[PDB]
Amino acid sequence: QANLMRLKSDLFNRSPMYPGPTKDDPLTVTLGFFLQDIVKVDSSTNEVDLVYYERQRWKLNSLMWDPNEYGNITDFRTSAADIWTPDITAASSTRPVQVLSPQIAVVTHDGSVMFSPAQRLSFMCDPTGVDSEEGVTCAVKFESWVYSGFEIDLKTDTDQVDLSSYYASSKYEILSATQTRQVQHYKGTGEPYIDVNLVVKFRERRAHHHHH
Amino acid sequence: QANLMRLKSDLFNRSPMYPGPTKDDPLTVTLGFFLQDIVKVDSSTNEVDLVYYERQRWKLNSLMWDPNEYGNITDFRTSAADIWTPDITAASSTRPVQVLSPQIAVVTHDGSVMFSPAQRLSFMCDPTGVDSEEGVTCAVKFESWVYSGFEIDLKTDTDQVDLSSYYASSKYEILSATQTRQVQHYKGTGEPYIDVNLVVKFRERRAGGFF
Amino acid sequence: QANLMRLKSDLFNRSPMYPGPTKDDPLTVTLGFFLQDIVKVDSSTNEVDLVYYERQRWKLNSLMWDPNEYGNITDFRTSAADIWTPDITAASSTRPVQVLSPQIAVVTHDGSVMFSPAQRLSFMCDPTGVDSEEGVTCAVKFESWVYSGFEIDLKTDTDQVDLSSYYASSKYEILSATQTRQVQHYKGTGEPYIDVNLVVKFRERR
Amino acid sequence: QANLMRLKSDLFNRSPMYPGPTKDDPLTVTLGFFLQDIVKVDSSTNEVDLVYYERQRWKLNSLMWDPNEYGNITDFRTSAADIWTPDITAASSTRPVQVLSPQIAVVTHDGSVMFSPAQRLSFMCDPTGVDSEEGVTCAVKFESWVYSGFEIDLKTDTDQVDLSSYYASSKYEILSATQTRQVQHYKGTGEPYIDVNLVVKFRERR
Amino acid sequence: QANLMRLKSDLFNRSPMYPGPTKDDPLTVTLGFFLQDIVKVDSSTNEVDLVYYERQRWKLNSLMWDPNEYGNITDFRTSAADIWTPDITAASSTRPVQVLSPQIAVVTHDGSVMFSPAQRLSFMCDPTGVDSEEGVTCAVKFESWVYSGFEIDLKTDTDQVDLSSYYASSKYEILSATQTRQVQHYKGTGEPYIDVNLVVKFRERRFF
Ligand SMILES: [Cl-]
Ligand SMILES: [Cl-]
Ligand SMILES: [Cl-]
Ligand SMILES: [Cl-]
Ligand SMILES: [Cl-]
């Protein structure tokens, strides 16, 4: 308790917060998607609702410490308000993303941050053909809304979306689910930016006592 | 009033907040569920909505005091913002949990904290067969989202969900309701983590029902 | 303006906030319900929606002052964030209560606080029979979620719910509406706690 | 920029906020409604949804300044959080009011404040007869939730609701729309309070 | 990291925030709309729902710096809470606008600010005729809610709404989409104010 209090005090109260990347000090954020359910499909509005969590990893020198100086603490948990987090946005959402997990991150002695927000997302998807063998395919790009490719790079460890927590009794069966890094260019300023394109192909399933 | 003001001042304004558990100083959180209603079932989205409250208990040395030093105060109530609370999460929720009770906890002179949030939860459940005698079974795991089993352990006092506040005129009759501690392992990591599995077996209310 | 600024400064900035009742210094909260409408009835989910306001009264020595010392001010209005308020909860709600009025209370020179939140509440109610002469009865208990009867007592001034603001053209006609203090015990006779039971008997209007 | 920074610093950082009216220093608030649409009518719940904006005007000595001392600035815009605003409430709402405009007010050198919140409101209204020639009438009272008539008075500049921004292709046609000051009396208290009664007569478009 | 920390500290902690424009120091805000989808149409309430993002640009002397004094930093990203932003409002909305993007802006060494909020908007629109060839036309004015034309001017770089991110499989096909500056006058005070009128002509999606 006491060593961790010191560690957090040293990291967060002494110095200000990481202000974000720049051209001279860019940052790489690694993303992985863990799809849990296709909850809803709306053929009258062409909206589909996903529940997933999104593993995000990055690394900052400012969050390094020597474990020997803090009782051999190698990592800790702390509110996401205590740190900078990347502004990763679903570019074709139709409602604000709903947060399903606590806004808490894991910080490791080398300055690695892991943040794994669970989300419910409504996004643009025509579900016509979902009730067939071939099913339907839909896509959503995840990107930093404000940083170019000169400041932020996004990558994946694998192009396969993890389906190991996918709900076994979902209304919808997943045929294919990929997460692919792409290079893109803004309209008015033509400078590059990175996205990770989530492409999911799916179809309807077939074969002294108180407290109150 | 005056003694309590001193007590809260001494506990909360002197020291910073408990920063959470670590490998060297882990924490045990005890959970108990008090199911009040199955409000809704949606067969087109495979979502079911529960209303319950969840008794949570844990213990911290930093919240100890000697009652003799504070006018024989043995316990007090305080806003949950004044203290650390565990990040217990329904792992198969489909909407943010809605809070139905005040965010207030009870702290006791030995450093025990009791926090009993009432919640409405939407979660993943195929209700096909709910309109039969046998009914349907659904499950939801409750776990710390960010702490492994090295930092947080979860347990129960009993594996039976309390149904004593269950709505007598619910659309749904509870046939069985259990809360069972389970050991689990993360995919990429491989290190262990604990959940409490809430398993509820229910059906649409009928006169009476296997004869 | 100036005298009130002094008064609020003296009450709120000098001392900390009232920390809540204890066994040695318990508190009595008086409740009164003013039912305005039964807005919705859902027979598929057994939920009913009420709109009402709820008069709450309590009294603290820490909020007393002598009017002579503050330009004869007998009472004032202030944000509910400036003071402690009781944690009165509908025990069978199914959604978070929606707030329909400003979170502002009235404080009086004797230390009386009056807080009258307007609310929309969804709660557990089987409405089967609402479309008959006899109608249907539903109940919801209002209680402190965290305080026992040793710390908080609840009472009413009358056991009759006030229907003087009840919407004349509601879909639902009120046959009876009562608010009754009850003594209760946590689980298998644990320590006591108080609730006010709101019982409303109603039917479709003719 | 610099003069305005000084002005705001002088008004908001030196003195505390206006604490609200009292019996000895009451306040007059003028209201005007600008009805933009009847968006929805629900005959199963007797709820109707309006979109409008509400001009509110009041005056405080504490917000006066001499323009000559601040580069001839006669008025400015500032966040509503920087000032006191009246607690004007629709008394028969069924959902929390949704805010459609930025919470920003206009302050003028004589201490006049203009605040014009756009709102979407659900309120109690039986729409039976809306699909006829005569249409239907509905009413909603706007009042301070916590202040009596001894502390707050409400007035209008005209008893005619402004329909100049009313949506030309609404589902509903407005036949008449009035805003009328009324004197009222509390149940338990008996002391007076003021409301402005918004009465709208409308029907389905033909 | 260190130079940017200094820059932000110098701009935001030393001086107070820009207090907004005045008659003597007015501000020009340039708007551009990027329509992404017509999500919904409700013929029973005459409401239509758009998803778009809105590029906003303005310029303040108080946000200037010399890049040479801050490790050649030419621009940075920062929370919109750190700065003044214009109060641009859809005048015929029927629900609060829902925010779909992070509230973060880009500031450039000359004092230019770019803020590009993605929004979902419900607004007043009779969709009768949407299921025909000719389709239907709807309009929504975007304006400062509180500032007159003496304090705020709005303009566009083009009168064509950008449709390059418009969802190819939307229920609704865009026939035409324009963004036009207009001069307007308040009722009681007869002084001018500016809006940008977004006019969208569309129809339900449909050679054999
Ligand atoms: Cl950081
Ligand atoms: Cl703590
Ligand atoms: Cl208090
Ligand atoms: Cl003020
Ligand atoms: Cl600024």
Author numbering:
A (entry chain C): 20 to 226, 245 to 249
B (entry chain B): 20 to 227, 229 to 231
C (entry chain A), D (entry chain E): 20 to 225
E (entry chain D): 20 to 225, 230 to 231
Paper passage:
Variants I and II presented structural features consistent with site-directed mutagenesis and electrophysiological data that suggest interacting roles for specific residues. However, our structures also emphasized that accurately replicating the α(−)/β(+) heteromeric site required changes to the β(+) side loop C, where the major differences between α-form and β-form sequences occur. Single-site substitutions were not obvious and we judged it necessary to make a major change, with four substitutions being incorporated (S206K, C207G, C208T and P209G). However, variant III co-crystallized with glycine and the ligand occupies four of the five orthosteric binding sites in the asymmetric unit. With this proof of binding we named variant III glycine-binding protein (GBP). One edge of the Tyr205 side chain helps to form one side of the binding site, with the hydroxyl group placed to donate a hydrogen bond to the carbonyl of Tyr166 (not shown), thereby linking two segments, and to accept a hydrogen bond from the glycine ligand. Tyr212 is aligned with Tyr205, creating a π-electron-rich region to interact with the glycine amino group. Solvent-mediated interactions link the Tyr212 hydroxyl with the carboxylate of Glu162 (not shown), which in turn interacts with the glycine amino group.
Protein-engineering methods have been exploited to produce a surrogate system for the extracellular neurotransmitter-binding site of a heteromeric human ligand-gated ion channel, the glycine receptor. Acetylcholine-binding protein is a highly conserved ortholog of the pLGIC extracellular ligand-binding domain (ECD) with properties similar to nAChR. Mutations affecting key residues in the orthosteric agonist site at the α1(−)/β(+) interface affect the potency of both activation by glycine and inhibition by strychnine. We therefore set out to generate a high-fidelity surrogate of this α1(−)/β(+) orthosteric binding site using the 2α1:3β stoich­iometry [Fig. 1(a)] by exploiting protein-engineering methods and the thermal stability of acetylcholine-binding protein from Aplysia californica (AcAChBP). Ultimately, the highly stable AcAChBP framework has allowed us to introduce nine amino-acid substitutions that have resulted in a stable surrogate for a heteromeric neurotransmitter site that binds glycine.
